[PDB]
Amino acid sequence: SLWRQTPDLEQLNASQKNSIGDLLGIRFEAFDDESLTASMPVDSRTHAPFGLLHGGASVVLAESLGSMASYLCVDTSQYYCVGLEVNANHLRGLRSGRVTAVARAIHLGRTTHVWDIRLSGDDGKPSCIARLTMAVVPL
Amino acid sequence: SLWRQTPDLEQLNASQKNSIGDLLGIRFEAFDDESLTASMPVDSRTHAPFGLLHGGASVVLAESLGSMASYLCVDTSQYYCVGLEVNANHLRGLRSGRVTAVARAIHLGRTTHVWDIRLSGDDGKPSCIARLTMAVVPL
16 A cells, blocks of 8 residues: 555566666566565676676666556556666675565655665575655656 | 776777676776766666666665776786776756766775766766775785
8 A cells, every 4th residue: 555556467578678677687576555566687687797796786776676566556647657766786796596675654745755765685584775765756 | 197007998998798787888988197987878778766866876886886987097917997986966866868988086095096077967967976995906
């Protein structure tokens, strides 16, 4: 019940067609009343030159997830949402498998949303934490 | 003379082979004694679903640029560098053309580097600003 629009995973995934999220293999995986989850492969598409997951790729995942979450929480006939501020601590390096991100709301205001996004590799250890501020903008 | 290793643009670009930077069309473009510059296309590879440059893609560019800059500033037989913290304000949306990033050093310490990275679209207006903290790590 965080959501205004009920998350439809197929449509979330489909909507990424011809964008970076599709290019990187980001997949919306699960949701509940308080969270939305997506994962992303750790391979050549997402590696930095030394074969570790690129820190910016973590942020593509987090910002893709957070911005999508914001879209599910506004009146889309009245508003759209763009990223305003993003930050992240890179905690542990990942070489293979997938990285999984979970987004939860810190604050959903009238003009801004703040999302807490937690990332971990397939061993379940925290790999990155991000905070995303979205701007809520009238068309 | 910021640099330890003199920037070699061809080799910088070549080193991205089979990583996200190659996948996204990031290109190292110029450097001087105080800065390093890379650009990235704004198109389907880098777009978010609404056809604007994905904010995370800005951060892939900034973090690619900053981490490469860090590699040019350490003793690579003694150390490597990984992203530690990154943050960015998204200032203006971009739909097409390229986005160009310039990295300058804020602080190069023994265990951390802080880089200031300024992004703009082809109209020269600031599109994003990032600050990147790299950790300098002994192999």
